[PDB]
Structures are given as structure tokens and as C-alpha cells.
Motif scaffolding. Structure first.
Motif, PDB file in Angstrom:
ATOM      1  N   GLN A 186       0.835  -1.231   0.000  1.00  0.00           N
ATOM      2  CA  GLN A 186       0.000   0.000   0.000  1.00  0.00           C
ATOM      3  C   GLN A 186       0.864   1.274   0.000  1.00  0.00           C
ATOM      4  OE1 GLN A 186      -3.658  -0.725   2.675  1.00  0.00           O
ATOM      5  NE2 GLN A 186      -3.619  -1.213   0.473  1.00  0.00           N
ATOM      6  N   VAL A 204       0.370   5.473   0.975  1.00  0.00           N
ATOM      7  CA  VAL A 204      -0.420   6.380   1.842  1.00  0.00           C
ATOM      8  C   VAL A 204      -0.018   7.782   1.428  1.00  0.00           C
ATOM      9  CG1 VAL A 204      -1.144   6.859   4.197  1.00  0.00           C
ATOM     10  CG2 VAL A 204      -0.099   4.654   3.675  1.00  0.00           C
ATOM     11  N   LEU A 242       6.471   8.826  -7.054  1.00  0.00           N
ATOM     12  CA  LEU A 242       6.156   7.376  -7.096  1.00  0.00           C
ATOM     13  C   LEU A 242       4.767   7.147  -7.697  1.00  0.00           C
ATOM     14  CD1 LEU A 242       7.388   4.702  -6.391  1.00  0.00           C
ATOM     15  CD2 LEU A 242       6.182   4.777  -4.203  1.00  0.00           C
ATOM     16  N   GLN A 258       4.020   7.544   2.088  1.00  0.00           N
ATOM     17  CA  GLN A 258       4.661   6.278   2.532  1.00  0.00           C
ATOM     18  C   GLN A 258       4.145   5.067   1.733  1.00  0.00           C
ATOM     19  OE1 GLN A 258       5.166   6.427   7.090  1.00  0.00           O
ATOM     20  NE2 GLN A 258       6.715   7.206   5.648  1.00  0.00           N
ATOM     21  N   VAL A 259       4.998   4.049   1.674  1.00  0.00           N
ATOM     22  CA  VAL A 259       4.781   2.739   1.030  1.00  0.00           C
ATOM     23  C   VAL A 259       4.952   1.691   2.130  1.00  0.00           C
ATOM     24  CG1 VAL A 259       5.550   1.124  -0.790  1.00  0.00           C
ATOM     25  CG2 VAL A 259       5.686   3.604  -1.164  1.00  0.00           C
ATOM     26  N   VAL A 260       4.016   0.754   2.189  1.00  0.00           N
ATOM     27  CA  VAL A 260       3.976  -0.304   3.226  1.00  0.00           C
ATOM     28  C   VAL A 260       4.084  -1.613   2.468  1.00  0.00           C
ATOM     29  CG1 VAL A 260       2.782  -1.133   5.272  1.00  0.00           C
ATOM     30  CG2 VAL A 260       2.321   1.178   4.453  1.00  0.00           C
ATOM     31  N   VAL A 261       5.063  -2.418   2.824  1.00  0.00           N
ATOM     32  CA  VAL A 261       5.330  -3.715   2.163  1.00  0.00           C
ATOM     33  C   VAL A 261       5.229  -4.754   3.281  1.00  0.00           C
ATOM     34  CG1 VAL A 261       7.007  -4.955   0.681  1.00  0.00           C
ATOM     35  CG2 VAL A 261       6.809  -2.487   0.537  1.00  0.00           C
ATOM     36  N   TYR A 262       4.249  -5.670   3.189  1.00  0.00           N
ATOM     37  CA  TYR A 262       3.821  -6.556   4.312  1.00  0.00           C
ATOM     38  C   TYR A 262       4.556  -7.902   4.257  1.00  0.00           C
ATOM     39  CZ  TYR A 262      -0.033  -3.160   5.045  1.00  0.00           C
ATOM     40  OH  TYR A 262      -0.792  -2.046   5.269  1.00  0.00           O
ATOM     41  N   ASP A 263       4.836  -8.405   3.062  1.00  0.00           N
ATOM     42  CA  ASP A 263       5.373  -9.767   2.782  1.00  0.00           C
ATOM     43  C   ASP A 263       6.624  -9.628   1.899  1.00  0.00           C
ATOM     44  OD1 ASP A 263       3.243  -8.636   1.315  1.00  0.00           O
ATOM     45  OD2 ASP A 263       2.431 -10.541   0.634  1.00  0.00           O
ATOM     46  N   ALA A 271       5.990  -9.369  -1.904  1.00  0.00           N
ATOM     47  CA  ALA A 271       5.784  -8.011  -2.446  1.00  0.00           C
ATOM     48  C   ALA A 271       7.136  -7.287  -2.606  1.00  0.00           C
ATOM     49  CB  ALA A 271       4.821  -7.262  -1.558  1.00  0.00           C
ATOM     50  N   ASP A 297       8.408  -8.480  -5.794  1.00  0.00           N
ATOM     51  CA  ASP A 297       7.503  -8.505  -6.980  1.00  0.00           C
ATOM     52  C   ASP A 297       6.776  -7.170  -7.182  1.00  0.00           C
ATOM     53  OD1 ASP A 297       7.952 -10.821  -8.402  1.00  0.00           O
ATOM     54  OD2 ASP A 297       5.930 -11.657  -8.078  1.00  0.00           O
ATOM     55  N   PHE A 298       6.538  -6.401  -6.118  1.00  0.00           N
ATOM     56  CA  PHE A 298       5.773  -5.123  -6.180  1.00  0.00           C
ATOM     57  C   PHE A 298       6.484  -4.153  -7.117  1.00  0.00           C
ATOM     58  CE2 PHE A 298       4.141  -1.155  -3.722  1.00  0.00           C
ATOM     59  CZ  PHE A 298       3.013  -1.078  -4.487  1.00  0.00           C
ATOM     60  N   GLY A 299       5.868  -3.959  -8.278  1.00  0.00           N
ATOM     61  CA  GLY A 299       6.401  -3.143  -9.378  1.00  0.00           C
ATOM     62  C   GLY A 299       6.759  -1.763  -8.893  1.00  0.00           C
ATOM     63  N   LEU A 300       5.896  -1.139  -8.097  1.00  0.00           N
ATOM     64  CA  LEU A 300       6.058   0.282  -7.703  1.00  0.00           C
ATOM     65  C   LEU A 300       7.430   0.508  -7.064  1.00  0.00           C
ATOM     66  CD1 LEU A 300       4.548   2.906  -7.772  1.00  0.00           C
ATOM     67  CD2 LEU A 300       3.782   2.470  -5.433  1.00  0.00           C
ATOM     68  N   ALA A 334      10.302   2.118  -9.180  1.00  0.00           N
ATOM     69  CA  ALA A 334      10.132   3.582  -9.392  1.00  0.00           C
ATOM     70  C   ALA A 334      10.477   4.425  -8.141  1.00  0.00           C
ATOM     71  CB  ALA A 334       8.702   3.857  -9.798  1.00  0.00           C
ATOM     72  N   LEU A 335      11.211   3.867  -7.173  1.00  0.00           N
ATOM     73  CA  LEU A 335      11.562   4.573  -5.912  1.00  0.00           C
ATOM     74  C   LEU A 335      12.921   5.193  -6.127  1.00  0.00           C
ATOM     75  CD1 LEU A 335      10.711   2.350  -2.801  1.00  0.00           C
ATOM     76  CD2 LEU A 335       9.537   4.405  -3.650  1.00  0.00           C
ATOM     77  N   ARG A 336      13.089   6.424  -5.635  1.00  0.00           N
ATOM     78  CA  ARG A 336      14.430   7.056  -5.576  1.00  0.00           C
ATOM     79  C   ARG A 336      15.162   6.641  -4.294  1.00  0.00           C
ATOM     80  NH1 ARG A 336      13.120  13.273  -6.726  1.00  0.00           N
ATOM     81  NH2 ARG A 336      11.154  12.473  -5.879  1.00  0.00           N
ATOM     82  N   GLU A 396      10.743   8.237   0.798  1.00  0.00           N
ATOM     83  CA  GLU A 396      11.824   8.858  -0.010  1.00  0.00           C
ATOM     84  C   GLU A 396      12.606   9.843   0.885  1.00  0.00           C
ATOM     85  OE1 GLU A 396       9.836  10.246  -3.578  1.00  0.00           O
ATOM     86  OE2 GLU A 396      10.616   8.611  -4.858  1.00  0.00           O
TER      87      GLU A 396
END
Ligand SMILES: [Cl-]
Ligand SMILES: [Cl-]
Lengths: 265, 265
Positions: free
Chosen positions: A113, A115, A127, B113-118, B121, B124-127, B130-132, B171
Motif C-alpha cells: 500500500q 499512503v 512514485l 509512505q509505502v507499506v510492504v507486508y510480505d 511483495a 515482486d511489487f512493481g512500484l 520507481a523509488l528514488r 523517499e
């Protein structure tokens, strides 16, 4: 034989949907009296209860529920306001889902997710332009009383900018376009399809079981999607407390059976 | 004249750092006795208190604190465990920061913010691609007792994959490489630099004030960065409850003055 009071503190719209004559009758017929909690009169004043079920959101309400719980420890609260606070911010809800991963052929994840707290970030946060459409966009903090607090679908970045932060977004491209809404009452599960290949019943039960231990909640549902990349993998995307049971038919029997289980705890 | 008991329920490492002879003496010299809460003996048994300050994390502790608070309403708890639960998940913490935006020449945001649980992700999480870099990577759920629950800096995507989800990323490229750690006690503010052009004092006070109303917390600090794109804009990146006051010098005087204010509430 003895009789069992079930106190109910619910918003009027929820009273109308949930507290139905068929519920009141079946419960009364089994010795269980559903009694409305006067909203205009402190809980600690109100009559003795064998069980308290509620869906009210306040620092006010929370306060009375805590008085009561220390005043009357043996009396089950459905659900305890600690457990319910975890689901109120749409990031915290998935944190509790992440706790049990021990549960075979099928697998369950939480989707990652994003936010976005301020309009300034919605425009400027780099992003966001690396996001695939559509998106599930939910507002960050939820309840069940405030209208805007149910999920919605965004196709263009234009449409996203027209939304009111704070909000949480997840990607919706791996979902195949399908959503299963699983309803849970204690150790009972009921499941429903919805368009915007059905998970094994033993998988749903494993997750429902997991969510219940982790959530510490008797009354919730959860939305899962198939991750259509594999054909066998499922994601928990939403968890809402005390959902619209009045929708699934025979809810009266499930809820009365659950109330009986609760007043012999 | 009268004497004032300050109960203190703190982890031993926090006792060592916070409860220092200079604190105990100054407080005692002003009529205020800092008294340790026996961890091996329920709060409701333990002696009468004019103020309770604590930093313990348990469903166990929470339970006793709630008994007490209904048992002894006029007795201030610093801080109330409701208020403290908001800061425990690193997404919920920024939700409470977003509440007051009314506070001139300078502006304050929350970073997206970005939350990655597993682990699934994280790979595999594409987004994520695209992170700096660099990134502030914090684990999602925090406290002050569990070690891993302080922020860290990631330069390569390799280094990110070697981290233990759940986690929250923001970021760090717009920050200019600087962090100011503002410490707050009731209506008092103290501020410190840190390397990994100083905000107007009236701006910090506006925010500190805002955070305090919103957070409902007497004892917290917050990290802010300059958004170096503008030269005048600042972001609140972390909020930690009951931080290491024992670090800023003359903390004893601030905390004793605050205790006095609290036992005349
Ligand atoms: Cl309903
Ligand atoms: Cl300290």
C-alpha cells in the motif's frame, strides 16, 4: 430456566438493518433478550447484561465501555474496543492481517500500500506516476458511520487528484476483476462473490481462523482477490468490523447460535 | 505542606537513562516523590499516586492502566494508552500528524509512505522499482523496547530486499541530508540538529502545539526535514512517544517543572 440479556449499542441505521424482528424473535425464543443500550444515559447505569455487542465510535463511548469492562469482567464485549481500534486506519488493518502466515496448495498475501497524507504529495509525489490503473483508493481512517469510509476504483491519474487525502491506494491489476467477501461470526464463516473459480473452503476457513486469532474479533468480514498471475494465490484487501450480516440469508440463526455460544463462555 | 507521589512504570534500560539522581533529587526537593511501580504486583494494589508516568507495552500493562484510570479518574496518566496506540504502527503515527494543518512563511507536510507486508511483495511489487534512493526504511510496528524499531537508510535495491517486512519506506532525496529532532514536554519544546539553516522557533512551536492537541500526548518528540526544493518547507517524518530526554541537558528541570504542572492540573 435462566434468561440472558444481550445489550446492543448500535447507530440507528445499523439497528434498522441488524436488529430485525426475525433476530429478536429467534433470540427471545431461545431465552436471549436483545435490549437496546440507551445512548442518552451512561452504560454503567444501564441494566445488568450477559453480553454487550456494539458498533459505536467515540472517545465518549470507548470510555464507558472501559469503565464497564473493569466494572464487569466476566461479561463478554463484542468486540473489545482495543481489538476494534486496529482496523480503523486502513494500514493498521493489514498489519494485523500479516500476523499469521502459517496457514497447503493455496497461498495468502497482503497487497503493498501507498499512503498519501496531503494534496501536495498527490500532485508532487513522483512514485504515484509509476502506479498501474486501476487502483482501489480508500480514505486512510474508517469506521462504518462516516459515509466516505468505503473503497472506490480509479482509472485515470486525473480522477485520483480529485480525491480527498489522507488516502491509501493499492494496485488492482493482478486481481482479474473479482472480489470474494467472506463474513465471519466467532468460528463460523460465510462467503459471497462480487464483480466490479472459488477458493477452497478449507483455505477460507484457515484465513478466517487466522484473522480471528490475530484480530481478536468475533464479528468481521474480509475481502480477498485471486492473484490471477498464478491461478491459486489470494490477497486480503479489506477487513471491516461488524459488517452487514443482514445481507447473507439465515444470518439470524448464525447470530443467535453465536450469542448462545457467547453467554456460556 | 502536601507531598505528591509520581508513580513510574518503565523498562529497566529506560529507568537507568531517565530516572537519574538529579531528577529524583530536584523533584524530591520540590515535594514530588518519584516512586517505582512494582512490575511484579498489580497497579491497583500499589500505593496511592498523584500522577502516573509509564512507557510499558503489553495487553497486560494496558489492562491494569485502564482498571486504574476508571478506579482513579482525577489521577493524570502520562500518557493515556489510547493516545499512545496511535504511534505504534508507523502509518497511524503520520495519520495523527495530518490532523492540524491550520498552522505563515513556512509550511509543514507529511511525506507519502509505502507499506510492504510480505517478502513476496518486496521482490515482486512493481512500484518499488520507481523509488528514488536513499530511503528511510522503518519496520511497520514500533514501541521503544524491541530493538529493531528505529529508522535506517537504504541506498541499493539489493539492501532493501535484505530487510524484514512488514516495513514502511519514505523517499529521502528532498531532505538535503538534514534532520532536526524536536523534543516536547507538555507546552515546552526543545530542538536538536543531526547529520545522516534552522526552522523559525515560532514554526516549531506551532507544530509542537498542533502535534500535542492531535496526539493527545504530553511526552513525545518529532523528526522534521527541510524539503530543500523550496528552502522554507518542512516534513514531519517520525513521532516517537516518551523519547530519550536524558540526552538534552537540563532535562531534569523541564521534567520536574512539567510534573509540578501535572499535579496541580
Ligand atoms: Cl447488518
Ligand atoms: Cl530518557
Amino acid at each position: 430456566p435462566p434468561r440472558y440479556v444481550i445489550g446492543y449499542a448500535l447507530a440507528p441505521k445499523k439497528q434498522q438493518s441488524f436488529i430485525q424482528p426475525s433476530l429478536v424473535a429467534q433470540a427471545a425464543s431461545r431465552g436471549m433478550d436483545l435490549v437496546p443500550v440507551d445512548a442518552s444515559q451512561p452504560l454503567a447505569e444501564q441494566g445488568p447484561f450477559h453480553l454487550l455487542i456494539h458498533k459505536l465510535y467515540g472517545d465518549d463511548w470507548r470510555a464507558q465501555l472501559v469503565a464497564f469492562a473493569a466494572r464487569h469482567p466476566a461479561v463478554p464485549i463484542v468486540d473489545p474496543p482495543h481489538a476494534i481500534d486496529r482496523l480503523h486506519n486502513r494500514i493498521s488493518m493489514l498489519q494485523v492481517v500479516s500476523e499469521l502466515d502459517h496457514a497447503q496448495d493455496s497461498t495468502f498475501g497482503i497487497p503493498s500500500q501507498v499512503v498519501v497524507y496531503d494534496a501536495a504529495a498527490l500532485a508532487d509525489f513522483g512514485l504515484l506516476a509509476a502506479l498501474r490503473f486501476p487502483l482501489i483508493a480508500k480514505p486512510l481512517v474508517a469506521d462504518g458511520t462516516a459515509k466516505s469510509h468505503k473503497m472506490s476504483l480509479v482509472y485515470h491519474r486525473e480522477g485520483l487528484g480529485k480525491l480527498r487525502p489522507p488516502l491509501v491506494l493499492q494496485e488492482f491489476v493482478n486481481a482479474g476483476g473479482v472480489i470474494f467477501k467472506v463474513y465471519v461470526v466467532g468460528g463460523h464463516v460465510t462467503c459471497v462473490k462480487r464483480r466490479s473459480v472459488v477458493p477452497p473452503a478449507a483455505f477460507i476457513n484457515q484465513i478466517a481462523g487466522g484473522l480471528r486469532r490475530a484480530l481478536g474479533l468475533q464479528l468481521f468480514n474480509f475481502d480477498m482477490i485471486r492473484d490471477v498471475r498464478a491461478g491459486d494465490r489470494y490477497l486480503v484487501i479489506d477487513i471491516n468490523y461488524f459488517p452487514g450480516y443482514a445481507k447473507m440469508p439465515g444470518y439470524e440463526t448464525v447470530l443467535t447460535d453465536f450469542f448462545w455460544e457467547m453467554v456460556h463462555k
